[PDB]
Design a protein around this ligand. Structure first.
Ligand SMILES: CCCCCCCC/C=C\CCCCCCCC(=O)O[C@@H](COC(=O)CCCCCCCCCCCCCCC)COP(=O)([O-])OCC[N+](C)(C)C
Ligand SMILES: CCCCCCCC/C=C\CCCCCCCC(=O)O[C@@H](COC(=O)CCCCCCCCCCCCCCC)COP(=O)([O-])OCC[N+](C)(C)C
Ligand SMILES: CCCCCCCC/C=C\CCCCCCCC(=O)O[C@@H](COC(=O)CCCCCCCCCCCCCCC)COP(=O)([O-])OCC[N+](C)(C)C
Ligand SMILES: CCCCCCCC/C=C\CCCCCCCC(=O)O[C@@H](COC(=O)CCCCCCCCCCCCCCC)COP(=O)([O-])OCC[N+](C)(C)C
Ligand SMILES: CCCCCCCC/C=C/CCCCCCCC(=O)OC[C@H](O)CO
Ligand SMILES: CCCCCCCC/C=C/CCCCCCCC(=O)OC[C@H](O)CO
Ligand SMILES: CCCCCCCC/C=C\CCCCCCCC(=O)OC[C@H](O)CO
Ligand SMILES: CCCCCCCC/C=C\CCCCCCCC(=O)OC[C@H](O)CO
Ligand SMILES: CCCCCCCCCCCCCCCC(=O)O
Ligand SMILES: CCCCCCCCCCCCCCCC(=O)O
Ligand SMILES: CCCCCCCCCCCCCCCC(=O)O
Ligand SMILES: CCCCCCCCCCCCCCCC(=O)O
Ligand SMILES: CCCCCCCCCCCCCCCC(=O)O
Ligand SMILES: CCCCCCCCCCCCCCCC(=O)O
Lengths: 155, 177, 149, 154, 151, 177, 177, 178
């Protein structure tokens, strides 16, 4: 049968980039956050980037979201600048390759031996599932912290 | 003022519960162009459970949706069952119970928090259910009034959750003064 | 048949995404704002209006006044940031797909974007300015009356 | 034959019609003024002045800084709609430029592949604007300094 | 002949813009940083240093940090035109990359789709090189300070 | 300084009103190749009258017919009746009256505030008018001096509104102090 | 809680070193489909030996032939000699050695900083090694548990580096008192 | 220190001026493949003024580039025909040098050092405009020669020296406030 267009899979929003790019993005995120934490607060002569704040900074730099704090040191600024460059390239390339995917549908036969349509909710359902899962997780973590700190109030 | 907040929370809880229950029950989710019963094409209610014929050879015939003919299979499982809309109704009911028990067996002050958490969770369950429904359908049409009853239920549930949390905050504030 | 050039809809700027995506975006925005408010203020140990503002500014890839400092707040903020990035990228990519395909259509044998294409966004903008002015004046009249007469 | 043309200075404005640019400028002034008015007009609450409103609006459009964000309901309404407007307009700019650079459509003036990298000739105008702005900035700074120096003598 | 699949360059992420655009972007960055420093801190009647000017300009180009913005008319002129420049240049980068990938996708010969790690590996090399450099600089400063105590 | 500001706002109000009134009156909004009173020839079209120039019978002017989806009908109505340019003129007039009445009744400062709100609203009406005009035209050409008179009226109206609000803030600072 | 921190860091250092060494020595990095020692059959290729299975003479296997525009030559050279995975192993070893020597010649509280630096650098080397590996593979497939052992070594090495730096900070904090 | 700062400023000013003057007079800007002398295509020098020929049957021959073989294009052609921007860069660097020289003599004015800083910054801006105009004018293979990179290095050094001058002026007015 002629290779009809495939139904968009949940988590098809990751398709523009190869699995290896995502995996290396995660490794680069951890490395950047750790090096920013190290460089920012290791010398006794410096004594706001703890490990948790370094991770937050890096995450929000990647998602081109807020800043809240910027390194003031030479070295922290080196780290921040290369992470900013990386982020710009990777996000631009994600958007560009997604545009390429949506512009030209390129069907391939499973075996060998146009008036473009609005994205449907099926095309991004996965990101909604992740969002609501994260909201549930956030509520759970908050309630755990509150129950713990309540027991600490008992004794 | 403080006195009216309990009334607003309780009436909102009741409204959300009633709307979500009606939506889960009624059949006007999707005005599709479907089959009244198989073995030609006309407008159909296609509610959550039963798709019911209208404007046809025999208007009014209602049948059970044939949900079935691995991710797609699991989505079919989650959609054929309405675990998420039903769970929304259950959580709204438990939230209403917590609000009711706010007065009887008073001064616990975590029952109100439980009410807020239940209402917020009911909202989240509702949204997941809506997304599952819409995803399952596709792959013309329109959305009936039961669908928008579900949507309005979500909005009201979130408002009531905010009120419940605000009331809990105000108690534990007075307490410290 | 004559070409019959099609007038873009007033609100054609919403065309890249299905109606259900916009609907679910609004539901997601309310859910995110409410959960951010609960996980941030519920512990006796970001009010609702500030949480709505945070979420709005996060979606428009714009503002950044305050950001959550707690673990729970940061989980909420992080997922919302991811969601925003995917949705906005997908909007721009699908708009580019629309315009590219419409540009390679050859009939049988300018290209800039016209004010007609983005008119609705201007209408919304000026409507919002009017609403803002009205709200300001209502608050001011209320405050003038509020002083003990 | 049509023979695809050499890109003009100020061709970076080509993705949007002249009317869109004009109305963007009008909307910018309107937004700035209304933000200033709805923020500094109540005596019942006496940062968003006239020059700080203009700066806020400018930076919101260029998807850049945020010194201050309106804290009132009304200022937040204004900011939110301006943010929406900005997002749509900039997205639309990028998308239409992509369409232009993907498919080339040469037009016959009278009727009765390999997608090269982008050359300095079709962003030259933005460089000219930048350096002109730097010159203007230096001029303004020097005028202010000369003025302050002369006044301080008295 | 066999189709001869192309091997992407390591620094292929620079392909959307000509070499001269990158060169002139760097010159423009230096110029903007210097002029912002000059107009901001040059008049007795005020007293953004050079390093802070450079940082401000970079995070405008990367559409990132917003630590501090100019408050004077001249600083604001410089900032505004640099923001304009950055908007145009980044939009143009993304648009031309999309053009590259879209055109390369509709080639049909005579008779994977995602972007591979090879297409961006150079940006990872730069990232890790920058992290190494940052650690080196931090340790150099720490050694300097630790050796600068009175003995 | 003070004393100059009142004169400057008054002059600006008059200038904005005169420019917008002229713009709504005159007919050099658009230079297009249309048809004269009923071949092709250049025609300065306006808000009301499309009129013929550089032809055998230049100077012959005809009323524009704005008619042969509901949005199309409503846009055609809103553009046929230049409600938004006219409302801009009316609001500028009312702002001028408020500024004039400022000299009397000076003890009450809410009349110099009203003046600012009227001028700003006039600017917003002007923007909507320009957008509807251009949009309706879109469903070679050029814009004439009438169009740019409308644009300059918008700019001056916004400046004068800023000045009016500024002086209302001073007046209410002197009485705060 | 110092004391348990030292045990946790030592365990982590040992785990990271062992995982990275196993990953380098073992050859289950890539489940390709290629030729065994010189029909296409599956293979558990590794860093050194492209090794055969489910074949005519399975289990007999050879040294990968790395070699058949200086950039291509340089990348092939860097991937032939697994300089970056090996350097990761060496740096993890030196980090562990510093942590061990943190008991002897105590009170320096400046070698534990070196331990942190070594672990961080080992992680960076590891990531470069992964990138070169995957890049050179592009000159169906899957990744084996050796690849993931390398990845897990990276993660644990970064955690241990953070702990080491934290302990150095705490030591100087105590000293400054 | 003040002495080291002043020496470094002076050396930088001289280096920038020398580099820009060499660049604006020498011919190795663009290794294109043009025509040695006309009215067979081979490699060329193609400087700012004269396109000498190389690797051909006759080398070393130079003709003045045929400027002017669209008013928007006409103005760019005119601005490239002269090198108003490279030349103006050279002049501004020279005037900055004069200011720095007048720094040591007739000193305590404190506004001539500022003048030097402004002139160096302006020279840098002129230089960048010149480079953009040049590169744009040649869009109608190739490579850039060492004279082009001399121009570029001149820009960088001029900006550094301008920074030094401004920083040095700020000190004088800090001292003159303590
Ligand atoms: C920081 C915190 C972050 C939040 C963390 C984690 C958040 C992740 C949340 C759960 C993710 C959904 C799982 C899922 O997609 O399964 C199924 C759909 O899923 C559904 O249809 C189930 C509907 C409810 C799921 C949401 C729970 C709230 C899909 O099947 P699958 O087996 O997952 O395979 C992928 C589909 N594919 C193979 C076609 C490509
Ligand atoms: C201030 C802020 C600090 C920023 C810090 C910036 C630091 C910059 C460091 C970049 C490293 C360059 C590596 C390199 O040359 O790659 C080589 C690959 O060969 C390899 O596989 C590279 C080996 C790993 C590099 C480890 C770091 C190939 O590179 P090339 O031959 O030069 O490329 C020309 C030809 N090509 C494009 C077709 C490939
Ligand atoms: C919280 C923040 C504030 C948020 C939101 C603020 C509120 C926004 C209100 C603006 C509504 C404008 C509008 O609906 O125009 C309509 C008329 O379109 C026309 O026919 C063109 C005429 C435009 C005149 C309207 C001026 C609005 C100014 C106001 C002063 C659009 O057409 P429609 O009939 O509504 O719908 C179908 C159109 N379609 C099929 C073409 C898609
Ligand atoms: C807010 C404050 C900051 C705002 C900015 C402040 C100021 C902006 C400064 C104006 C620059 C743009 C004008 C130059 C130009 O276009 O002329 C020519 C080249 O231009 C050149 O070759 C001149 C290069 C020098 C430009 C300015 C340097 C100032 C120092 C091009 O000829 P044209 O006829 O102009 O082209 C018409 C358009 N067309 C090509 C599409 C047909
Ligand atoms: C105060 C600020 C602190 C410092 C902030 C640093 C962050 C900015 C770095 C960006 C990437 C730099 C590297 C750009 C890559 C160059 C690669 C290249 O030139 O490739 C040559 C190619 O082969 C053709 O010749
Ligand atoms: C420090 C504060 C913490 C903030 C934290 C914020 C979270 C931000 C990221 C969310 C996306 C992560 C989920 C990505 C899920 C990918 C789905 C997947 O794994 O793909 C499925 C399969 O591989 C193919 O079929
Ligand atoms: C807490 C502070 C709150 C700030 C508040 C300001 C934010 C406003 C943002 C966006 C408005 C967008 C309005 C969208 C209107 C589109 C509706 C529409 O047109 O839908 C019908 C459609 O045309 C049928 O085809
Ligand atoms: C509040 C203080 C802020 C200070 C202000 C900061 C600068 C604003 C940003 C960009 C200016 C862009 C200028 C655009 C120049 C356009 C040139 C143009 O239009 O020329 C094309 C020609 O019309 C075709 O024929
Ligand atoms: C900045 C750090 C986090 C950013 C979000 C990154 C998302 C990580 C996803 C990792 C797994 C991706 C799997 C895709 C491949 C596949 O579908 O087979
Ligand atoms: C966080 C807010 C995001 C912005 C929200 C934009 C407004 C969306 C509202 C729904 C509009 C529906 C448009 C589709 C109309 C149709 O085709 O019937
Ligand atoms: C935030 C508001 C300012 C944003 C920057 C807008 C500057 C561009 C305005 C140019 C005017 C229109 C002229 C170009 C169109 C043409 O002639 O083809
Ligand atoms: C300030 C933003 C960062 C950008 C800096 C990038 C500098 C790149 C320098 C030129 C190298 C790329 C040119 C490719 C050459 C070729 O075509 O072979
Ligand atoms: C904030 C930026 C200000 C914008 C500066 C705009 C300067 C360029 C204006 C060009 C107008 C061209 C007239 C078009 C003629 C016509 O078709 O009517
Ligand atoms: C923000 C600072 C970034 C600076 C980046 C510097 C990179 C320099 C690389 C220069 C490569 C030049 C290639 C020569 C090409 C040619 O003309 O043949």
């Amino acid at each position: 049968k002629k290779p009809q267009k495939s139904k968009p899979g949940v988590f098809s929003f990751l398709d523009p980039l190869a699995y290896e790019i995502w995996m290396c993005i995660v490794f680069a995120y951890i490395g950047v956050s750790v090096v920013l934490f190290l460089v920012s607060r290791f010398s006794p002569y410096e004594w706001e980037f703890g490990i948790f704040n370094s991770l937050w900074f890096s995450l929000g730099a990647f998602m081109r979201q807020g800043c809240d704090i910027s390194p003031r040191s030479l070295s922290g600024r080196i780290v921040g600048g290369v992470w900013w460059f990386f982020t710009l390239i990777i996000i631009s390339s994600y958007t560009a390759n997604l545009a390429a995917f949506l512009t030209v549908e390129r069907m391939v036969s499973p075996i060998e031996s146009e008036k473009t349509s609005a994205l449907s909710l099926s095309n991004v359902a996965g990101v909604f599932y992740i969002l609501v899962g994260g909201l549930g997780l956030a509520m759970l973590v908050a309630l755990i912290e509150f129950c713990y700190k309540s027991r600490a109030e008992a004794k | 003022d403080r006195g009216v907040q309990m009334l607003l929370t309780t009436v909102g809880a009741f409204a959300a519960f009633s709307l979500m229950t009606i939506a889960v029950g009624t059949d006007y989710w999707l005005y599709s162009r479907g089959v009244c019963k198989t073995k030609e094409e006309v407008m159909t209610h296609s509610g959550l459970w039963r798709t019911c014929c209208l404007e046809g050879n025999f208007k009014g015939l209602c049948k059970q949706i044939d949900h079935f003919p691995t991710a797609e299979y699991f989505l079919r499982a989650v959609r054929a069952s309405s675990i998420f809309p039903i769970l929304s109704v259950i959580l709204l009911f438990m939230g209403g119970l917590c609000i009711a028990a706010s007065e009887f067996y008073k001064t616990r002050h975590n029952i109100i928090l439980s009410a807020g958490i239940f209402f917020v969770s009911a909202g989240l369950s509702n949204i997941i259910g809506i997304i599952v429904y819409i995803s399952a359908n596709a792959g013309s049409y329109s959305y009936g009034w039961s669908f928008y009853f579900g949507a309005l239920s979500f909005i009201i549930a979130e408002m009531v959750g905010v009120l419940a949390v605000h009331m809990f905050i105000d108690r534990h504030k007075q307490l410290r003064a």
